[PDB]
Ligand SMILES: C[C@H](CCC(=O)NCC(=O)O)[C@H]1CC[C@H]2[C@@H]3[C@H](O)C[C@@H]4C[C@H](O)CC[C@]4(C)[C@H]3CC[C@]12C
Ligand SMILES: [Ca+2]
Ligand SMILES: [Ca+2]
Ligand SMILES: [Ca+2]
């Protein structure tokens with residue numbers, strides 16, 4: 001779920017506002033940087049989750065789906081007991097948290113004017 005995703009991210013990056021063209025609700029145009037590509041990819045991963053013919057989320061939003069995950073040394077692990085739909089969402093969140101961690105944060109992209117540059 002969305003609240004879990006927040007903690008998963010803090011687990012991958014020990015110690016939020018919109019960013020780029022895709023880090024926020026929705027998104028448009030082209031990603032501005034690597035971190036913004038991490039979000040677009042996440043956006044697209046959720047998009048694929050909805051397309052799963054076997055999965056149907058509450059309010060058609062994957063962010064409502066709660067799964068089970070653990071965190072060791074900044075290492076994220078999705079519980080294998082998660083159902084297929086939950087596993088798919090957990091992995092989208094996981095890859096994104098890792099994608100974020102190894103990505104640069106360009107202050108000039110925080111709260112970007114998506115109406116102009118996206
Ligand atoms: C982990 C990164 C980086 C944070 C950061 O570097 N802050 C300043 C600093 O301390 O250096 C942040 C940048 C924009 C954030 C995203 C945006 O705030 C949009 C959205 C907000 C939701 O609460 C969580 C998911 C989601 C999709 C956030 C995931 C975390 C992101 C991708
Ligand atoms: Ca988005
Ligand atoms: Ca359902
Ligand atoms: Ca669930």
Ligand SMILES: [Cl-]
Pocket residue numbers: 056057058
């Ligand atoms: Cl469901």
